[PDB]
Amino acid sequence: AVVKCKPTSPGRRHVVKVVNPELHKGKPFAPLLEKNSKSGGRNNNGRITTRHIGGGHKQAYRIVDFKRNKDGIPAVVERLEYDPNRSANIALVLYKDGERRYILAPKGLKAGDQIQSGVDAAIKPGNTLPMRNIPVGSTVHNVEMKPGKGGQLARSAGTYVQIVARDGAYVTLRLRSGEMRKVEADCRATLGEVGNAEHMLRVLGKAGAARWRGVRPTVRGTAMNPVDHPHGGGEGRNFGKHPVTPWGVQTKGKKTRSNKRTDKFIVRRRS
């Protein structure tokens, strides 16, 4: 549920938050936790390779099952949990053999719900099947790109993929971007959409909230000097240039995709 905050202070006036009373209030499941330290956008040369990364809250990593490989064995959703590593919520599920895992929580999943993966699984949200067994016209998420690799597409909060056609060994998928892509029919998918669809309705409200998430300030190129950015310079506010990146590449409309290896799988670009 989205709640607007009362304007008790200027940093609070514009805040809109997403409060979900159904998320676990305790600690995460420890055997499925790992460490992950922050990079600051720095690679192994120590150099910044992505700008505007740094700080923010310390976060533990939750091992999430994207493969969904325990087929034939039903699992019950123990609970829903907050995951700081992603926009979607996760679900702690317990298998009939005593194994516990984390999965992406699809829309409508609640504690006590039952899920299953495999060719034999029923066609209902949360179940994972090969798309060759999934009917054409279905809404799926956590979609594999290579058989056995694990879900890579439609993982963000509220996202989903539409199975549009099936021809031979390949399904055609409509992705959130609007792209039409070919994937092998033996690739697995999970039925339903990713939950937490109201994630995009939150308003941060203040600069500090973005700082909490590890985002550092963006300085406009025009605000710099010519030595620093192609947009820099000028007595007062001047632009008079075609907009480019800090490295000199046109940044309003110029296409940058060049992958002839995967061109053949695209039926239609997003436009």
Partner RNA sequence: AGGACCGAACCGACUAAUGUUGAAAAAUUAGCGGAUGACUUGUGGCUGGGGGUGAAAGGCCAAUCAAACCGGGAGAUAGCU
Partner RNA sequence: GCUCGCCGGAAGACCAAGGGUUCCUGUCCAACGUUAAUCGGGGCAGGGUGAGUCGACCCCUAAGGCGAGGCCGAAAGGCGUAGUCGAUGGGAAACAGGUUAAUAUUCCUGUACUUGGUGUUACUGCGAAGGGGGGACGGAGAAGGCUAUGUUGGCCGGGCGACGGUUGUCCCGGUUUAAGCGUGUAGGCUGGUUUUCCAGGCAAAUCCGGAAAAUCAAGGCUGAGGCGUGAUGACGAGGCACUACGGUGCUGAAGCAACAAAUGCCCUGCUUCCAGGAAAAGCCUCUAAGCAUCAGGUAACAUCAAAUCGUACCCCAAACCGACACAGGUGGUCAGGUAGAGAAUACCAAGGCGCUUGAGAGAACUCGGGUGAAGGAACUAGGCAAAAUGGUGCCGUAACUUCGGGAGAAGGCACGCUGAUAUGUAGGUGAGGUCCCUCGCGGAUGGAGCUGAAAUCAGUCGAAGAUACCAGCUGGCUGCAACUGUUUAUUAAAAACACAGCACUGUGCAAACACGAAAGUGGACGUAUACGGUGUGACGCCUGCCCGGUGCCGGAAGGUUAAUU
Residues that bind Mg ion in the complex, under the rule CB under 5 A: 52, 218, 220-221, 235-236, 238-240
Residue 264, binding choice from RNA, Mg ion, none, Cβ under 5 to 8 Å by partner class: none
The alpha carbons of the chain give a radius of gyration, in whole angstroms, of 22
The least CB distance from residue 24 to RNA, in Å, is 6
Contact characters 93-122, RNA, x per CB under 7 A: -xxxxxxx----------------------
Residues 203-222 that bind RNA (CB under 7 A): 203-213, 215-222
Q: Which of 39, 114, 133, 162 contacts RNA by CB under 7 A?
A: 39
Residue 168, binding choice from Mg ion, RNA, none, Cβ under 5 to 8 Å by partner class: none
Q: Which stretch binds RNA (CB under 7 A): 120-128, 164-172, 184-192, 226-234?
A: 226-234
The least CB distance from residue 92 to RNA, in Å, is 11
The least CB distance from residue 85 to Mg ion, in Å, is 16
Is residue 140 within 8 A of residue 126, CB to CB? The reply is no
Q: Is 19 or 123 the residue whose CB approaches RNA more closely?
A: 19
Q: Is 166 or 176 the residue whose CB approaches RNA more closely?
A: 176
Is residue 152 within 8 A of residue 143, CB to CB? The reply is yes
Burial class of residue 209 (count of CB atoms within 10 Å of its CB; 0-12, 13-18, 19+): middle
Residues 156-195 that bind RNA (CB under 7 A): 156-159, 175-177, 179, 181
The least CB distance from residue 167 to RNA, in Å, is 18
Residue 10, binding choice from Mg ion, RNA, none, Cβ under 5 to 8 Å by partner class: RNA
8 binds RNA (CB under 7 A): yes
The least CB distance from residue 264 to Mg ion, in Å, is 19
Contact characters 53-72, RNA, x per CB under 7 A: xxxxxxxxx-xx-------x
The least CB distance from residue 132 to RNA, in Å, is 20
The least CB distance from residue 166 to RNA, in Å, is 18
- Alpha carbons 125 and 107: distance in angstroms, whole number: 8
CA end-to-end span of the chain, whole Å?
Answer: 33
Q: Is 53 or 165 the residue whose CB approaches RNA more closely?
A: 53
